[PDB]
């Protein structure tokens, strides 16, 4: 009694995108059936996959129509397609794997910024601060202290990377600091404003 391969557990195939942090073990399954019993094969980005194609390789448990990847890494990012097929038909599902590396550290400020600037009395000057940080960082501008700018709903990160000092005076002369910190630590870069 011929029957083309078919998904036996279609619901456990709903999650097409698997985003995980590195090293996490990932397993994709294609529970299917059909007589005569269908064969199961996998494809990484359309091409033919093979155990030696990744460290530790892959493990295929036909018993559960699944493929397993131990300690996944950026190199594994891609599309994986399972192909269940017998003599009377074929079916296939495709999962998307995305591996995320997290940078759990205090914010990092672009070296060199802000930059010392010497300007004419009354001029206009703008200081810059390029911040990097996985967790949402909180930037704040200081004058040596006097808080001059602080990230938040009132002052979004859009405008926090640049401090504008309009029509300066001998008073505005001094050291400014860009302080940015997240829940892991604090980082800051200073800079000197020289007014003539």
């Amino acid at each position: 009694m011929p029957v083309a391969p078919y998904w036996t557990s279609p619901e456990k195939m709903e999650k097409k995108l698997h985003a995980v942090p590195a090293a996490k073990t990932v397993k994709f399954k294609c529970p299917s059936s059909g007589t005569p019993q269908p064969t199961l094969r996998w494809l990484k980005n359309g091409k033919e996959f093979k155990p030696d194609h990744r460290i530790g390789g892959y493990k295929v448990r036909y018993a559960t129509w699944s493929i397993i990847m131990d300690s996944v890494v950026p190199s594994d990012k891609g599309n994986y397609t399972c192909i269940v097929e017998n003599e009377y038909g074929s079916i296939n599902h495709t999962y998307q794997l995305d591996v995320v590396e997290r940078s759990p550290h205090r914010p990092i400020l672009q070296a060199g910024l802000p930059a010392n600037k010497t300007v004419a009395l009354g001029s206009n000057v703008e200081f810059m601060c390029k911040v990097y940080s996985d967790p949402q960082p909180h930037i704040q501008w200081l004058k040596h202290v006097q808080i001059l700018k602080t990230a938040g709903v009132n002052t979004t990160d859009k405008e926090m990377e640049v401090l504008h000092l309009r029509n300066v005076s001998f008073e505005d002369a001094g050291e400014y600091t860009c302080l940015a910190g997240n829940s892991i630590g604090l980082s800051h870069h200073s800079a000197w404003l020289t007014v003539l």
Partner: protein, 129 residues
């Protein structure tokens, strides 16, 4: 980039946190959804507001522990963003300090009152956009 929007992929079922323009909050697996682009802003070290870019609303958790997005900010739109040791993020309400933002394996949120440290619904993975 801290300034670019992000999508919040919840470990529990792969649902992206989504903010509807009407204020409803739930999840969608579709990466192309027009309401999953969120602008996370820090209000201070370890504390963020989560703003749905398209809905132009803020994710806020009410006292009963239900989610929704306000048009204007309130003390309920602030959460402790924490990069857990497993590399997933958790958004714990700074107001109702024992509850997290979470999604059920069905694409609907989970009452903060029902959220907990050992749960998969609370884990989120920030993704560029």
């Amino acid at each position: 980039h801290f300034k670019d929007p992000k999508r919040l992929y919840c470990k529990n079922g792969g649902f992206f946190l989504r903010i509807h323009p009407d204020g409803r909050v739930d999840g969608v697996r579709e990466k192309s959804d027009p309401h999953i682009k969120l602008q996370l802003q820090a209000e201070e070290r370890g504390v963020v507001s989560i703003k749905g870019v398209s809905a132009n609303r803020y994710l806020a958790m009410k006292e009963d522990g239900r989610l929704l997005a306000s048009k204007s900010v309130t003390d309920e739109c602030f959460f402790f963003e924490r990069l857990e040791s497993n590399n997933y993020n958790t958004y714990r309400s700074r107001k109702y300090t024992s509850w997290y933002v979470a999604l059920k394996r069905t694409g609907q949120y989970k009452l903060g009152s029902k959220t907990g440290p050992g749960q998969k619904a609370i884990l989120f993975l920030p993704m560029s956009a």
